[PDB]
Design a protein around this ligand. Sequence first.
Ligand SMILES: [Mg+2]
Ligand SMILES: [Mg+2]
Ligand SMILES: [Mg+2]
Ligand SMILES: [Mg+2]
Ligand SMILES: [Mg+2]
Ligand SMILES: [Mg+2]
Ligand SMILES: [Mg+2]
Ligand SMILES: [Mg+2]
Ligand SMILES: [Mg+2]
Ligand SMILES: [Mg+2]
Ligand SMILES: [Mg+2]
Ligand SMILES: [Mg+2]
Ligand SMILES: [Mg+2]
Lengths: 127, 36, 188, 65
Amino acid sequence: KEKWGIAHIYSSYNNTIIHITDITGAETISRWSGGMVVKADRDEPSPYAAMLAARRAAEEALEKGIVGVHIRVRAPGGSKSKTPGPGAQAAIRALARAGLKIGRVEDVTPIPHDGTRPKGGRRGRRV
Amino acid sequence: MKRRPRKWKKKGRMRWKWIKKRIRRLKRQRKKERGL
Amino acid sequence: AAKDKWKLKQWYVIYAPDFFGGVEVGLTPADDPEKVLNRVVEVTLKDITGDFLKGHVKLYFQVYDVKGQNAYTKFKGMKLARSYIRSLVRRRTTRIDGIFNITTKDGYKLRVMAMVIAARRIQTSQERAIRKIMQEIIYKKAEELNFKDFVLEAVNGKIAAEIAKEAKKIYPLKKAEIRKIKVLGEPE
Amino acid sequence: DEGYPAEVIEIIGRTGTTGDVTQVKVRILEGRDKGRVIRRNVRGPVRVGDILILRETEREAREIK
RNA sequence: GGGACCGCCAGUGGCGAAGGCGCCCGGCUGGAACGGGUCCGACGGUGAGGGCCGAAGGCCAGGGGAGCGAACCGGAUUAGAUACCCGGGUAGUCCUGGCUGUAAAGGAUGCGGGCUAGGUGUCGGGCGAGCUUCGAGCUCGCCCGGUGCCGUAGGGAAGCCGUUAAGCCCGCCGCCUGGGGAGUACGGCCGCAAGGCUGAAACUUAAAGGAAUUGGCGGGGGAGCACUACAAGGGGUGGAGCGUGCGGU
RNA sequence: UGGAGGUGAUUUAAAUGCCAAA
Ligand SMILES: [Mg+2]
Ligand SMILES: [Mg+2]
Ligand SMILES: [Mg+2]
Ligand SMILES: [Mg+2]
Ligand SMILES: [Mg+2]
Ligand SMILES: [Mg+2]
Ligand SMILES: [Mg+2]
Ligand SMILES: [Mg+2]
Ligand SMILES: [Mg+2]
Ligand SMILES: [Mg+2]
Ligand SMILES: [Mg+2]
Ligand SMILES: [Mg+2]
Ligand SMILES: [Mg+2]
């Protein structure tokens, strides 16, 4: 019939990870990060690295019979930043251009109800 | 110690907190030399 | 070698539980049939029954039995989408939450989270009165029905309509919902 | 391999560290994405009706004020 | 499996003497506002001595230890870097029973009483009128008590304050008397310790201190401009020999 | 029109003041 999967996208200020699994989440189809396609640490979070990694992952998934995906995009969350980096939308767009159908899109950043304390002291980074 | 909020102003002097620490260091030494 | 290990997998069909129709919801790959147990799949209510209104309701089904190429599921929990609840909460309104532990007629342990939104800011005593009304209605319904009927009424919106009708006596309302359900234990 | 021709339809404004770059909007004339309208950064003098040769057509420049 | 913490709603919003207090249900308990042809009958204000409460940190015994993190151990930056930045990390932060009694503990404004234009928000109670889906609901007006803003007379060096006075009057207690030496020395009391409360002189000095003005400056913001600015370009000087000017000898 | 608060951020390195004035 139709084999649908899930694309988990992890976006921070330092890197991007694109991880395609099956509908239940328990079996991995492909997994590509920014440091696997570019050679400079400075370029790992850039949008272009996101496009390259997304294209590699989409090809590997298409060869194995996946037809479309649902998307789950997240920032680090927790006691770290709640805002996704610059490579989220670029990764989302490059999946559709590569041949997959796109289902529903949502963000699953984990948000505390007044949880743990953040690193940096009571004055924070002083640069 | 007694409060002199005029001492906390920074024009023409060093920080009052560290003057206080220096005074307290100097007072420990006199106390220890007394008991001997 | 890696491409060799992929070819050993077979694809299993996942079915909805009996009282949701028992329709197909997807396929999962696995090499050994025992590894399919306890896997969880999330689907919306709109897929089960076509209606573009109930697309923010998410249901969780868990695998328990495999026979041939088919896997069968049990109801596990329900939740409303984050973007939907995040849009109801505004300034100059009041949000009332109540979290209750219940037992159905046939000894099922559930935890239920219900939410109510009022048209304006209200005093805390009125919040307590509304929460008490919610507790009474939910306890009576749980004592009255069986597990399947309770779940169906919780996702169809009937309990929320009853709660709103009863709680209009304290203050006019804007919304009333069952926010979340999780199953805690099962009969022996 | 030989690029894709695109045509300038609007000038937006100057940018860059020393004001050497212009942002424009182009419409693709060839390939898979014929007809699409995207914005780009161009170096050198340019006017409406010029034709650019793009080596790739999936990168879009960040909008300026 | 574990320890800490209760997001959005949340509001110059609420409660408390101050410090402080925010998930939900049940039990015990303190204070205040409004309504009152109820009772007592000046029983009141302030308060030297004296008493109780009191953030964080620290100390003494016994538990706990997720995250963060004085000291400390490594990696960088730098002329150096005992720091700022990055990876780790002990005490501590949490619970029970005690000690300590300190903060820009700031409304930098002690407490009670009478009086002296207005305007406009918001929280609690009461009264009147009009709606209503009959709601412990909505809108408007007035009285009392809290909590904000703009402002008349008056006050003030001015900033500003102005029925929530820093205005005019009737009370009681505390404190101050140019800048430093100094919150030090000596004596005493208190504390396990760390420390707390009390507190001079010889000598030195012509200002120290406050509010506002005009400029100049900022590794502050905005707007503009220049080939003795850059960007895009064309030609060069800096290396050699010589002409000429300057320093030195 | 003019004010009072709150939450976020803020891209390497960059020390000093001599002849004078008399
Ligand atoms: Mg890397
Ligand atoms: Mg620096
Ligand atoms: Mg003074
Ligand atoms: Mg560190
Ligand atoms: Mg305070
Ligand atoms: Mg009222
Ligand atoms: Mg008032
Ligand atoms: Mg005023
Ligand atoms: Mg002494
Ligand atoms: Mg020049
Ligand atoms: Mg140039
Ligand atoms: Mg030469
Ligand atoms: Mg200097």
